[PDB]
Amino acid sequence: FFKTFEWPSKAAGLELQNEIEQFYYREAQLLDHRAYEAWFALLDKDIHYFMPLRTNRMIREGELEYSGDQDLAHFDETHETMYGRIRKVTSDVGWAENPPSRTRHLVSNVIVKETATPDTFEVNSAFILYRNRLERQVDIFAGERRDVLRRADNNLGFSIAKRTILLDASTLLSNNLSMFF
């Protein structure tokens, strides 16, 4: 259902390119240093935070690789349910992240596209999420993020309106997804 990101033939301006990249780099810093309240503040009221299931299909049935909007997902969240996730992760009795993990969000491959709304941008990016916890536990994630970002008066310059995380996995190799993407 997803296929190649429809990049604009005319590439985004250097100033805009730099701003979006810098937004992600700041966001990664917020996540890796567990500033969850500050990261959640970036989420707009109408946020759709979504991570579909990915399956092994024969090329002939390739249209069925990703789960749909009425199927199960790894994440299918709104502002209200995300708040609860932030509530849990910051909680002393939240055993999955207390002691907390050690994450690295290495962001690259940023492609910026204009939408039909001015100052709203559709951004395609790639990441490797390295998660280390307890003594020896290491979980490496890779995939892409398809975002809808809005210009905003905040510390980072943008707010998140939509996030679809396309993970390079069928079966998850991690015991949980106690980290934010």
């Binding site: 049935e61 009425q70 199960l72 609860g84 849990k88 055993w95 999955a96 998850l172 015991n175 997804l177």
Partner: protein, 432 residues
């Protein structure tokens, strides 16, 4: 090689003691694939996972890959996903529709029934009817598809026994029956299957104490915290007469359902036409199903579900120190769109790998298994004494052997049956 006498001493239901070696020993695990998984009824999915002709779903029976595929006569067949020539996978995708199955190694062709129909260059180089993949016994229980290799094993209904009323709380609410919401979520946990099987069989204790405090908090209104949250204490627990099956539920605690599933599902389950139709359809059991909330269940060995939440999962063993979790969601076929979406959203929110409840289970199990690498950690029996001797068969509301919600009678039974299956070679003695 373990002796029957040495196996029997690994579990003691009288004293309430468990040998920690059962979760870790390699040769006990190699036995489990033969003695337990080789002859047990195992959940593979739901009828609606394979609705049309040729529709298949690649899954597991223990560590044996199997294909579940719908036949033209509406029956469901299950066969080992292994070619008998040189062992190659016949069905190489997760799911889909097939008109045929072909081996990619030497091109042995199969029909959707798992019968060998063509061998390339057969005339130049034996009967094809004898060399198809191993076939499993298939049975359906009210939507759910089960499988068993052993022709000498008791059939599904008999295997299930008096555990059936508690399955029906989830499975038999409407004349239309249940449908599986699309999507099979899969993740890996470094723990023994028995910890996970037991928790859903018997362990309401973990949810009513410390494990899920942050999970509850996640549903709790922003202006409220845990000090104001009701702690459910009223409920019961069921031990199957035979089979090591178990279930547990809260009684008259609708706030515990509200805290997990939200208001719309709480309404759907407790009040209205649908809730009343469900209790009248289970009248033969005499159970007040509208008052039954937060329920957990394991059909031994590895079939586990959460009836009130519509969450279902299979534990695929991967050695003594690992499992895979394969989870899906059900809904009544004729349930309103609004309710189906609420069950879908909340199941993702709570019971996926990222779930606000699930996260803390995997976290607990990972540490336990790590601890069992040590010698002294395996030297002393683990306590399984909760609810010892407090269960009775004559409960006015709930049939079978029933005790208090916070007990380990269902667990002791699971482990006693595990022990039995492991120590008793023949069904002549092992069957109900």
């Amino acid at each position: 090689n373990w002796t029957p006498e040495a196996i029997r001493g690994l579990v003691d239901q009288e004293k309430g003691l468990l040998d920690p070696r059962i979760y870790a020993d390699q040769s006990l695990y190699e036995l489990e694939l033969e003695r337990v998984f080789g002859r047990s009824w195992l959940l593979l999915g739901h009828e609606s996972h394979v609705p049309e002709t040729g529709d298949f779903l690649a899954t597991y029976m223990g560590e044996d890959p199997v294909v579940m595929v719908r036949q033209k006569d509406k029956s469901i067949k299950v066969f080992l996903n292994q070619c008998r020539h040189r062992g190659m996978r016949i069905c190489r995708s997760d799911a889909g529709n097939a008109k045929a199955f072909t081996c990619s190694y030497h091109g042995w062709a199969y029909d959707i029934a798992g019968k060998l129909v063509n061998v390339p260059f057969e005339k130049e180089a034996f009967d094809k009817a004898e060399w198809g993949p191993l076939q499993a016994r298939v049975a359906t229980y009210k939507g759910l598809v089960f499988a068993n290799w052993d022709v000498q094993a008791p059939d599904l209904e008999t295997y299930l026994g008096d555990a059936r009323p508690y399955m029906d709380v989830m499975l038999d609410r409407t004349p239309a029956g249940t449908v599986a919401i699309g999507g099979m979520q899969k993740w890996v946990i470094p723990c023994n299957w028995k910890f996970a099987a037991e928790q859903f069989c018997s362990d309401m204790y973990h949810a009513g104490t410390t494990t899920h405090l942050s999970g509850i908090l996640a549903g709790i209104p922003p202006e409220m915290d845990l000090s104001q949250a009701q702690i459910p204490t009223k409920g019961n627990q069921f031990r199957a007469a035979w089979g090591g099956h178990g279930s547990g539920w809260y009684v008259d605690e609708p706030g515990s359902l509200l805290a997990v599933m939200g208001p719309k599902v709480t309404q759907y389950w407790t009040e209205g036409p649908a809730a009343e139709l469900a209790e009248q359809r289970l009248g033969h059991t005499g159970m007040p199903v509208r008052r039954m909330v937060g329920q957990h269940m394991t059909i031994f060995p590895t079939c586990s579900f959460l009836p009130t939440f519509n969450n279902i999962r299979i534990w695929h063993p991967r050695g003594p120190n690992e499992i895979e979790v394969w989870a899906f969601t059900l809904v009544d076929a004729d349930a309103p769109a609004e309710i189906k979406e609420e069950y879908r959203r909340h199941n993702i929110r709570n019971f996926s790998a990222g779930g606000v409840f699930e996260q803390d289970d995997g976290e607990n199990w990972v540490e336990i298994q790590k601890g069992l690498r040590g010698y002294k950690a395996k030297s002393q029996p683990l306590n399984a004494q909760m609810g010892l001797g407090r269960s009775q068969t004559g409960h006015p509301d709930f049939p079978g052997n029933v005790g208090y919600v916070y007990a380990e009678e269902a667990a002791r039974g699971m482990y006693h049956h595990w022990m039995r299956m492991m120590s008793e070679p023949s069904w002549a003695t092992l069957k109900p």
